[PDB]
Amino acid sequence: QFAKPEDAVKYRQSALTLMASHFGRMTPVVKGQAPYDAAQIKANVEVLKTLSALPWAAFGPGTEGGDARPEIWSDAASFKQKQQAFQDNIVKLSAAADAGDLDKLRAAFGDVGASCKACHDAYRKK
Amino acid sequence: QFAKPEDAVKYRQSALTLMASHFGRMTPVVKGQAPYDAAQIKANVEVLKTLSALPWAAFGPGTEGGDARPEIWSDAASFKQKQQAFQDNIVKLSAAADAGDLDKLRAAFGDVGASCKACHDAYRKK
Ligand code: HEC
Numbered sequence: 662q663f664a665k666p667e668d669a670v671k672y673r674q675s676a677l678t679l680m681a682s683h684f685g686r687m688t689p690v691v692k693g694q695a696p697y698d699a700a701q702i703k704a705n706v707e708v709l710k711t712l713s714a715l716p717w718a719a720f721g722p723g724t725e726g727g728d729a730r731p732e733i734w735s736d737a738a739s740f741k742q743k744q745q746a747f748q749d750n751i752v753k754l755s756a757a758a759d760a761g762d763l764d765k766l767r768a769a770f771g772d773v774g775a776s777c778k779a780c781h782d783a784y785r786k787k
Numbered sequence: 788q789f790a791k792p793e794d795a796v797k798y799r800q801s802a803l804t805l806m807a808s809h810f811g812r813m814t815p816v817v818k819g820q821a822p823y824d825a826a827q828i829k830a831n832v833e834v835l836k837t838l839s840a841l842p843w844a845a846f847g848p849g850t851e852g853g854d855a856r857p858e859i860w861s862d863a864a865s866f867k868q869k870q871q872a873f874q875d876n877i878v879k880l881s882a883a884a885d886a887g888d889l890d891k892l893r894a895a896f897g898d899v900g901a902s903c904k905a906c907h908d909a910y911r912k913k
């Protein structure tokens with residue numbers, strides 16, 4: 662699916678756009694500004710789970726480009742920790758949505774958000 | 788998540804890009820050019836299933852734009868049939884991948900591909 666580096670770039674941007682939409686639409690609920698519908702949120706976090714595993718296979722060897730920093734590949738073990746923290750947090754968000762527990766949801770949502778930003782601070786260009 | 792029409796456009800393009808990648812990478816397998824790995828294909832068709840439900844909620848009222856034809860909204864019942872045919876075909880592709888049946892996979896893959904194109908012929912701009 663990633664014939665050239667541009668194809669991997671275009672795939673991972675698309676996946677990261679979809680993840681931002683499915684994460685970011687739950688903001689009103691975790692803040693108390695919109696009623697919590699546990700079944701709907703459970704569905705939507707399942708969508709987000711599926712999508713949040715996708716981008717990483719498109720940052721394989723030789724796919725420099727976009728707004729990806731070179732350090733993604735020159736510090737691969739460190740990038741891998743930033744990716745694993747974020748995927749670990751998604752596991753937590755899934756556990757809270759599957760349980761129907763809003764306070765755990767909100768806490769796990771908070772951990773997700775911060776891991777998004779921690780990876781951006783270190784590996785996404787301005 | 789779709790504050791302005793541009794946001795819906797950007798979401799649905801992204802979802803449709805991801806679907807094209809997960810559909811199109813199975814071409815070598817259904818044609819016999821790559822060995823069939825039933826478990827891997829089963830996983831990948833589950834990804835494709837999730838993604839293939841996403842675009843349609845972003846063609847709601849007032850989201851004209853991109854390469855979407857206006858007839859999507861002026862002939863909504865007809866567009867809805869083109870969407871349902873395609874989602875019906877995804878159900879078939881899932882049934883074949885979940886069964887591990889390559890000939891049914893290949894046939895259902897063929898129906899999917901054609902529904903993609905039938906909707907494009909009628910509702911995607913040149
Ligand atoms: C590294 C481990 C990351 C994690 C975790 C998250 N993101 Fe990120 N993001 C990352 C990179 C390297 C890039 C640039 C990719 C490129 O090749 O251009 C991005 C980009 C985005 C974008 C822009 C997508 C686009 O349309 O170009 C968005 C909207 C985005 N990231 C959001 C986002 C969110 C919401 C995350 C947590 C849920 C998240 N990312 C995690 C690296 C990493």
Ligand code: HEC
Nearest residue numbers: 800803804807810852853854855869870873903906910911
């Ligand atoms: C209507 C019922 C459609 C079906 C079924 C499929 N697609 Fe399509 N596609 C459709 C529209 C109206 C558009 C234009 C959207 C816009 O607002 O610009 C598209 C676009 C695509 C694209 C381009 C995405 C982008 O990056 O801009 C691709 C790659 C694409 N469609 C592929 C595709 C495949 C592979 C399908 C079957 C698996 C499929 N689409 C179905 C309408 C419809």
